[PDB]
Design a protein around this nucleic acid. Structure first.
Lengths: 282, 282, 282, 282
DNA sequence: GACATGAGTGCC
DNA sequence: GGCAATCATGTC
DNA sequence: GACATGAGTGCC
DNA sequence: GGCAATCATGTC
C-alpha cells in the first residue's frame, strides 16, 4: 500500500534473518520476503506488514484499519526499524575492507524505544534465543491482544508494566533485580524520562541512562544503538565482541574501535557477522 | 510527492491562518493553498511543501532531495503538525455545542518538540506577531541555511543554542532570564531530558517541565498542547482565557473545563477562537 | 556529689514546673526541690539527679555509677538543660518590661538533641499533656531499661527508632506520617545529619531541617529553641503565640518580634507565660 | 579548681608528648606537667589549663574568668580530649598482647570537631611539624585574640573560614584544592552538615564525609578517630600503617585488623607507636 | 551483565 | 593521599 | 509570564 | 502541625 525508498545495496536476507532470530512470538512474524507485527501508536492499534521490492528498491507497507489514523508515524517507525536512511556508499567507503563482504548491511532498529529498552534488559546475560523466549513470556502476560487480529498481541505498554508485580515477572524467568529494572524503565517511559528518540549528545544521555537500576554500560550502549539507531557506538563489553578481540580489555577494544568513527555502530555489526574476523596483524 | 489522509471536515483556512500568523520568516512560507518550511532531521535537511487536497481529503507532501533519505519521519512530522489523526465526528460529538461552529477545527502541532519549546518561551508576555519577528531573528542568527534552497534556513538546533552567548541572545530583544531559559532548554534537549514525544503521564511530565528555569505552568501547558499535541490540556493561566472566563480564578476555570475532558485541548482552541464566548450559568 | 553554679535570679519554681508538665513517665521524675531522669551517653547508662540550692545558688548533680565514666558530659548536658550560662542582667536588660514579671526565667533546654527532636514531633498539634503521654508510649516500647533502676527507662536511641515498624508507632496513637517522621529523624541522627549542637547558621540549619518529612517551620523553630538552645528564635506559627497577637499574620508577628533581637527566644518564653500580654498597636 | 577522674593506668607522658608534637603556637601550650589552650564556647572565651594529678588519679582543670558561664561544657571538652572515660582493663583485656607494653595508652581527642576537621586536612601529605606551623599560620590569620591573654588566640570559627579568600590560604602554604577543602568544611560547619559529635553509624557518616571535596577515606578515618573519638576505626591507608604491614593491601590490613574489634582505634595507636611491629608471619 | 569491593596505576 | 580511570573478583 | 513571598483553605 | 493546592501581590 504505502511505499518508501532505500538506496541499494540492501541486504534484506541478512536483516530479515537478524530480526527473525530475535522475533517475539505473537508480536512479530518474519519470512524471507516480508516482515509483519502488531503495533500500537497511542490508542491506535493494528498490524503492519513490510514487503520489500528488490527490483524497485522500494518497501511496501500495509496497515490494518486501526493504524490508518496514524499512518505516517507507522511509516516513520518502519523506516527507523529498517534504516532506510542509510547511504551504503558513505559507510562502506569509510569502513573499507571491514564491510566489503556485506555492503548491504543495515542497522536493525526498533519501532519503539520503550520496547527496545525492555528487550535490551532481558537480553542481559542470556542468549539471543533465550531472551526472545523471556520477552515472549512477558508479552504474553502483559500485552493486549488485537481484537481484529487475535493471533497477534501488542508489546506490553509502559503503564501496564509499571504496574506489574515484581514477583510475577520474576516468576517468568528473571532475577527480582531484572524485574525491578523493567518496572523502573516503564515509569521513566511514563514520565518522559527515557529518551524515545535519539538525543543530541548520545554519550551524555547514555551516562544518564546508566544511573537507572539494572542498566549498565552494555545495556545503555546496546540500547542507544538499537533504540536510538545511534550510528557511532561500539559494544566493547559485549560477549561475542570479547571473542572477536581475544585477550583485550574493554578499554583496549574501545580504543581500537575508534578507527571506525563516526560509523562505529556499523563496524560493530560487521565484526559480529564476520565469522573469522580478528584484529589487524600489526 | 507523497500523500496522507485526513477525515472531514478539516478547516484548512483556519489552520493555515493560525500557522500564518506565527510563521517565522525564512523558516516557513504560508500561503492559503500551501504550507512550506525548511526541515532538519539529524544531518538531513531541505524543504517541505504541504498542499491540501480538499478534492479528496488528502494532503500532498513534497520533499526536496536532501530529505528523501528520511522521507518517512518528515511525513510523520507533518502529520503531527496538521493533526491528521483527528476524527472530528468523535471530538465534536463530545464537545457538542462548543465545536458546532467550527467542526473542522484541528490542533496545530509542531514539527519538532525542541523548536516548539523555544517558541513557547519566546511567546511569553509578547504579542503573537512579536514572538514571530523575535523568533525569526534567532533562526536567522543560529540557523543553518540550506544550499539546495538558499532562501530558506533551518530552525536552530539544540547544540547551536546550548552554545549561545546569553547576552548575544538578549541583544535580539528579550530579557536575560529568557535567553537563559532557551540555553537550558537546548541542554535538556541535548541530554534527552526534554520529552520529544508525548509521554504516558502528561501531568507528571508537565510538572517536571516546570522545574526548568524560565518555564512556569502556562509554558508547560502550552508546550504540552503543541509540542506533544496532548489533547486533554487546558490553559487556565492564559491571558485571553482569563477574559473568556471574566473574574474566575484558574482553579474555577479548570473546574469548569473538566466538562470537556478528554478533549480539553480542542475545547481550548474553540474558546480561543470564539470572540465573545462566555461560560454558562452552571 | 557534683556541683555547678549559676547567676541569680533563677526561677527554679518555673523551670521545674515547665519540665514537670512535659515529663515522660519512667524517663523523668520532677519534684519541687529536684529533677531526675534516666540518661545514656554512648553505652554509659544511669540516673541523674539535680537538686538546686537557691541559698548558695548552685546546682547539686548526682550521678549513678554507670555514668561516672562520662561525668563531664553528663554535667554539660545538665547545664544545657538548665541554661546555667544565662546572664539575666543582659537579657532582662535587653527586654525591659517583658521580662519583669519573672526575671529568673530560663530557656528550658534538653539533655539530648535527638530526644528533643522526637519530643518536638510528638508535640505537634496535641496538648502538652497528650504529647507527654504519647512520648511515654514510645519510650515504653523502644526504650532501654536500666538494670540497676527498673523503675527508670532510657529514652529511645536512634538505632532503635530507625529500625522501628511504622505501623507499630502508629498503633501508639499517632498518624502514620508522624511515625514516618520519627523513623527518618532517627536515620538522620544515625547518619550524622541532625545537628546535635547549635550550628553557626541557625537560619540555614533550620531551613535544611524543614526538608525533613514531617518537619515544618514550627517544629524546626521549636527544635532550634529547645534542642540547640538557640537564643534568638521566635515561634510566629505557634498557636498560643497567634492568640497573643490577634489579627496578625505569621510575618507580621515576625516583623514585630525583631524588636527583641538578639534574644527572641527569651521574649517568646515571656510572652508565652503572660496570659494578659498584647502587642502595642503601632 | 575543677576535678575530673580517670582510671589507671594513664600514660600522661605519652599523651602530652602526642599533643606537644602537634601543638599549634598561640593556640595551645604543652608542658611536662600540664596542658593549656585557648577555648571559645559561643561568645565566651578564655584559657583552659589541664594539670594531671597522678597521686589522686585525677585531672585538675582551671578556667579563665570568661569560660565560667559554660564551665561544664569546657569540662566535657577536656574529657573528650583526654579520653577520661577509658577503662584500660577492658581495652587491654581485649587487645591482649598488643597493648601489654603501654597499658596507659589513650585516644587523643579534640576540643572541637570543626577544628579537628581543619587539622586533619591541614595535616595531609605533610609532616606533623609542618601541619603544625601551617595550622599556626591559619590560626593567626583568622583567629580571635584573647584580650585577657594577648599571646593566646582562639581557633578560627566556621564563619570566619567560610568567608576567606581561597588564595590567602594558599599563600600561607597549601595547594588550591587544600584551601577549598577548608572553606567547604567551614560552610558545612555553619549549616550543621559536619557532625560535631559521634554519629550512631560511624561507617555511614564517614562514607558521606568522603563526598566532601578534599576529604578522602583517610581524612574521614582520622577525623572519626580524633574529632569524634570513635573507638573502632583503623587507618589502612595511612603511610606509617602501610609500613607496619609490609606489602599487605588496604583490604588485607583492614581484615587483619578486625581481630581487634571493637577497639580498633586503640590497636591503631599502639601500632603507630611500636616501631619494630609486624604482624604474625602466620 | 549489573554492581560493590578492591586494587593498580598515575597525576596535582 | 585527594581523586579519576580502569581491571579483576565474586554474588545475584 | 516567571517567580518569590505570603496568606487561606482543606485534608491528612 | 505538615503540606499541597490556590490566590493575590510585587518585581523583573
Amino acid at each position: 500500500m504505502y511505499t518508501l525508498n532505500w538506496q541499494p545495496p540492501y541486504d534484506w536476507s541478512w536483516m530479515l534473518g537478524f530480526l527473525a532470530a530475535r522475533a517475539v512470538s505473537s508480536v512479530e512474524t518474519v519470512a524471507d520476503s516480508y516482515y509483519a507485527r502488531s503495533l500500537a501508536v497511542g490508542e491506535y492499534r493494528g498490524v503492519v506488514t513490510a514487503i520489500p521490492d528488490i527490483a524497485r528498491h522500494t518497501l511496501h507497507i500495509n496497515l490494518s484499519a486501526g493504524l490508518e489514523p496514524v499512518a505516517a508515524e507507522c511509516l516513520a517507525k518502519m523506516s527507523r526499524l529498517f534504516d532506510l536512511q542509510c547511504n551504503p556508499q558513505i559507510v562502506n567507503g569509510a569502513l573499507g575492507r571491514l564491510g566489503a563482504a556485506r555492503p548491504g548491511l543495515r542497522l536493525p532498529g526498533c519501532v519503539d524505544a520503550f520496547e527496545q529498552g525492555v528487550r535490551a534488559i532481558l537480553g542481559q546475560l542470556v542468549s539471543v534465543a533465550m531472551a526472545a523466549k523471556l520477552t515472549a513470556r512477558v508479552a504474553q502476560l502483559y500485552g493486549e491482544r488485537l481484537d481484529d487480529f487475535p493471533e497477534y498481541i501488542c508489546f506490553p505498554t509502559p503503564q501496564r508494566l509499571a504496574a506489574a508485580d515484581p514477583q510475577a515477572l520474576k516468576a517468568l524467568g528473571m532475577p527480582l533485580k531484572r524485574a525491578e529494572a523493567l518496572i523502573h524503565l516503564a515509569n521513566a517511559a511514563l514520565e518522559g524520562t527515557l529518551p524515545m528518540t535519539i538525543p543530541g549528545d548520545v554519550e551524555q544521555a547514555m551516562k544518564t541512562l546508566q544511573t537507572f537500576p539494572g542498566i549498565g554500560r552494555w545495556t545503555a550502549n546496546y540500547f542507544a544503538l538499537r533504540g536510538w539507531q545511534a550510528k557511532d557506538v561500539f559494544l566493547p563489553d559485549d560477549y561475542l565482541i570479547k571473542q572477536r578481540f581475544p585477550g583485550m580489555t574493554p578499554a583496549q577494544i574501545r580504543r581500537y574501535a575508534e578507527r571506525w568513527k563516526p560509523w562505529r555502530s556499523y563496524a560493530l555489526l560487521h565484526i559480529w557477522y564476520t565469522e573469522g574476523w580478528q584484529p589487524d596483524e600489526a
